[PDB]
Amino acid sequence: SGAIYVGNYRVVNRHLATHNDWANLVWEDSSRDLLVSSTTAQGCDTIARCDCQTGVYYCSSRRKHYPVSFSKPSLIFVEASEYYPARYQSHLMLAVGHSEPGDCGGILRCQHGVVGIVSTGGNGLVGFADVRDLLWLDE
Ligand SMILES: NC(=O)[C@H]1CCC(=O)N(Cc2cccc3cc[nH]c23)C1
Ligand SMILES: [Zn+2]
């Protein structure tokens, strides 16, 4: 689990969104595994606007942060799960690192701020849903 809080927005994994996230829906994209809902309180997370390929992520299944090199956002094939059939997920970045399904929502950060959230994994890989192109989150 885990979310990003920026201004009047809350970003979560679309497969983990709540009834309240859906009742206050701003934008959702199944192909990206992302959902943004509105909040009354003002968020203080800083979103990165960059093309960094190094950063640090939080892995709840180890209670640790890990430094990683990751690929640029791309269309990657993601095996089936209880939430989606087998499909290509867009705007996904991969790195060699530990992850388990319960790690979804753990934040990836570079020196400029929040890059994305854990969304996929397996076979010693971890995938992050990018958020750096969502310029509207800041305004
Ligand atoms: N399609 C998706 O974006 C998600 C949907 C829910 C989900 O459990 N997964 C599989 C998964 C996620 C994170 C980490 C690992 C490790 C093994 N399986 C993992 C993929
Ligand atoms: Zn950066």
Check the CA dihedral 54-96-62-115 and report its sign.
positive
As to burial, measured by CB atoms within 10 angstroms (0-12 exposed, 13-18 middle, 19+ buried), residue 9 is buried
Instruction: Answer yes or no: are the C-beta atoms of 84 and 90 closer than 8 Å.
Output: no
Catalytic, 103? Answer no
Q: What is the SS3 assignment for 11-53?
A: EEEHHHCCHHHHHCEEEEEHHHCEEEEEEEEEEECCECCCCCC
Can you give the residue ranges of every domain in the chain? Answer: 3-44, 45-139
| Whole-number Å distance between alpha carbons of 74 and 1 | 23
Which among 94, 95, 133, 91 has a CA at the least distance from the CA of 114? 133
Active site annotation includes 33 = yes
| Size of the chain in residues | 139
The rounded distance, in Å, linking the Cα atoms of 107 and 74 is: 18
- Known binding-site residue numbers: 50, 52, 110, 112
SS3 state at 60: helix
Q: Are 32 and 89 in contact (CB under 8 A)?
A: yes
Sheet containing 87-96, strands listed edge to edge, beginning at the edge strand earlier in sequence: 64-69, 54-59, 107-110, 113-122, 125-130, 87-96, 74-78
CA torsion, ordered 23, 6, 17, 97, to nearest 10 deg = 170
Q: Which of 15, 29, 45, 98 is catalytic?
A: 15
Structure-token pair, residue 42 = 């003002």
The partner residues of 116 in beta bridges, in order of sequence, read 108, 130
Between the CA of 81 and the centroid of ligand 1 the distance, in Å, is: 7
Could you give the C-alpha distances from 131 to 63, 72, 123, in angstroms and in order?
Answer: 23, 12, 24
Method: X-ray
130 is known as an active-site residue: no
Q: How far is the CA of 83 from the centre of ligand 1 (A)?
A: 9
Measured in Å, residue 67 CA sits from the centre of ligand 2 at: 13
Identity of the residue numbered 125: L
CB 53 within 8 A of CB 117: no
At which residue do the structure tokens 């570079």 appear? 110
Q: Report the distance separating Cα 73 and Cα 3, nearest Å.
A: 19
SS3 102: helix
Q: Which residues line ligand 1 (CB under 6 A)?
A: 15, 33, 78, 81, 83-84, 89, 99-101, 103-104, 119-122
Report the nearest-CA residue for atom 17 of ligand 1. 122
Q: Pull the structure tokens for residue 28.
A: 């959702």
